[PDB]
Symmetry: C3
Subunit: 176 residues, 3 copies
């Protein structure tokens, strides 16, 4: 059901690695450093560091000829672990909160994407989140730009729970 | 020496998965619905590679996720391992502020169901686990989210994988 | 090219485990608890926890007869994963910053080690780092003491990016 092809070099050149399952460490046997990717069946969630840590990259089906094709930010060219991302959800519901522990101003998003949180009274601060239904991806900047943070069904009482160092988010969309 | 049986559904129904060693990713079973710990304790985790919310699993029966989890942060359980608790003594130092600063409390071979009984409020910002394995909780009487402290030093609440320094009770992991 | 020998007991006694590749868990049918280490060919980057998490220990070539020989901080006696560390760099360039997102006072270090950041206008605070060339290791206390944090070539916009809970650093050196 899932398949990703990772290449040692840019433009789908060099050593080729096909994966149909999660990989907690790409340097364990597979590649030295991922240069390009083809997602044949996904989506996949890729990570800058080993064991599904560090910066996140949602990889939909398609071609990524270089690291700047999957990184919407330019913080890191490292990709060391990745896994299939379960997106089997008919409805999407997300609650964003101004302050930690689901306190302060609240924004509810239902079966829609938000390219700018500013259009709904928020600033560039999201300090707790409730992903009621579906999988979502939040971004640092408007129009789905900068670093990505994935929200799967569950509660996030503080920005550290979604692996962010700061509560800055300016756009969010459903993974579908 | 260790053995856990995980079931796909609640009340020990559906597909089974027997483990006698750590598992960094349960992906084998779609979603754990119930657990029988035959020989433990085990330390279970909401996420892969021993990350996310923690659940200490002593020997016994857990017919549904709310039997092992006290919070609503997740029903997901994706990794788990045997927890070594072979320690004759237990010593824990709790600190008010990060980097072992401010008010200090020492706990020796005892459990504390309310930190408020010892002048601590609900703020623990650094910890020293001198001897033994401990488990701290958000609320008094060992309620809410759990955080395991194995022997070592924690200069900030993020070191024990907490987003905030709130703790109100703590106990030793022992039989 | 890489080789580490791990022993069950102190002073290179008990059961042995030889590794020439990364190991995400030393308790997964290898050893009960590492008591001593010989690095035959390195350097290696070791970790307190499984899956390359927790406190870091840079292990150069040589003999470590007890846990407190590799841990320059009486933090933990635990060592559960480790990997070879690539240090193939002819030059070393590091930029340290006072505040996150490469803001505030800046220190540039070129092909040199700094046993005290205080000797160059910093306090015990480093909140973002640019590792332009080479691999580096930062420490909590002056003279390379306390907990270690490895910096590989790349950008670190916040202290959490190098897996620190706080921006306290007082010395830094090249891994060579």
């Amino acid at each position: 059901s899932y398949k990703v092809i990772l290449y040692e070099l840019e433009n789908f050149q060099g050593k080729r690695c096909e994966l149909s399952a999660e990989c907690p460490s790409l340097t364990d046997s597979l590649l030295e450093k991922v240069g390009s990717i083809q997602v044949e069946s996904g989506p996949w969630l890729a990570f800058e560091s080993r064991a599904f840590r560090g910066e996140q990259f949602v990889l939909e089906k398609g071609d990524y000829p270089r690291w700047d094709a999957w990184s919407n930010s330019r913080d890191s060219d490292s990709l060391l672990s990745l896994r299939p991302l379960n997106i089997d959800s008919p409805h999407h519901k997300l609650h964003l909160f101004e302050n930690p522990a689901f306190s302060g101003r609240k924004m509810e998003i239902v079966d829609d994407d938000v390219p700018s949180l500013w259009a709904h009274g928020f600033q560039d601060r999201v300090a707790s989140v409730r992903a009621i239904n579906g999988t979502w991806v939040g971004y640092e900047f408007p129009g789905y730009r900068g670093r990505q943070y994935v929200f799967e069904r569950g509660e996030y009482r503080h920005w550290n729970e979604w692996d962010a160092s700061q509560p800055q988010l300016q756009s969010v969309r459903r993974i579908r």
